[PDB]
Amino acid sequence: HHHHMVDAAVAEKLEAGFQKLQEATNCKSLLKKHLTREIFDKIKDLKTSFGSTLLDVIQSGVENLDSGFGVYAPDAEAYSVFNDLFEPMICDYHTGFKPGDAHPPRDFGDLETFGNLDPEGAFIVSTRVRCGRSLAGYAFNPCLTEANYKEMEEKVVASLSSLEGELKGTYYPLTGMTKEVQTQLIQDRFLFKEGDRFLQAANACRYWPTGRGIYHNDAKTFLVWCNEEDALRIISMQKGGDLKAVYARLVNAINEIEKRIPFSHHDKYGFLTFCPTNLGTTIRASVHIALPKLAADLAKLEEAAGKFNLQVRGTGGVYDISNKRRMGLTEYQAVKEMYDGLQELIRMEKEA
């Protein structure tokens, strides 16, 4: 498709959408905040080579004015063609990344440099690390054909089915999924279904449930979703606080998948994802930790965690601790911010 010219129908819906955002005087989305009339007028007639327009970017945040973010990338090239809108939204949302920065090449780092965080189990309830990936050579959800979903699933399942040892497990397609399996996966908190209204409006649920499925290892410490928001959502999780083991399992899985399937990647934004909140390392690390002594002063807790760019959220003195930074640092740096921040928080708890 050409870089220029959208048809009259698309132009008309785009104008109607801008007006709807403006008429919404109280709308809080980053879309409303960053799509100025000047940016809109500059990029409204552009297209990617896949034929995606600005409407394929903003429609979800127009249909759902209460979105927090409110745009998605219909294909990898949208991040460039429509960078005038994506850039300010990305650099607003993410911590420590600014226009002109280039996200570093992937580096999981030296796993041996991770210690043991809470061997006794006195503090940390559970530990999770989540990543996402898109498959190189395909558009993203709004542009995928029925044939695309089938081919991506075949490739993903070929990789997952060959996982050995710690990672060995079972793939469950959504296509034909039995009520028995739905019930079992719900109990494990492993099931996804057809997307909510934000994904529906983004045209991310086309040809449902073709190409969609759920994989987990037998120990239920490794989970993969195929074709939900991204081609791959990859999670390592376990009870207790052994961040080294959780991260090592994740690294082993992603490396093994990459040997067969390259991932969509951008020179400045890192790994490309359907929602721009998942860019860079894509890392969403989360530890539930009991800090009842530090709970007497939430501000010193928030402040101490913030020295390592960690976010504190009460869930009772139990907190969800997570990495603020996903872009502009390596995977090793992000997971080490969690390790070092949690180390300081535990020392503070013991000292109080």
Numbering used by the authors: -3 to 311, 320 to 356
Which sentences from the paper describe this structure?
Arginine kinase (AK) plays a crucial role in the survival of Daphnia magna, a water flea and a common planktonic invertebrate sensitive to water pollution, owing to the production of bioenergy. AK belongs to the phosphagen kinase family and acts as an energy modulator when bioenergy is required in invertebrate cells, by reversibly converting phosphoarginine and ADP to L-arginine and ATP. In structural aspects, both AKapo and AKholo have been shown to consist of two domains, an arginine interacting in the N-terminal domain and ATP in the C-terminal domain. AK from D. magna (DmAK) has four highly conserved histidine residues, namely, H90, H227, H284, and H315 in the amino acid sequence.
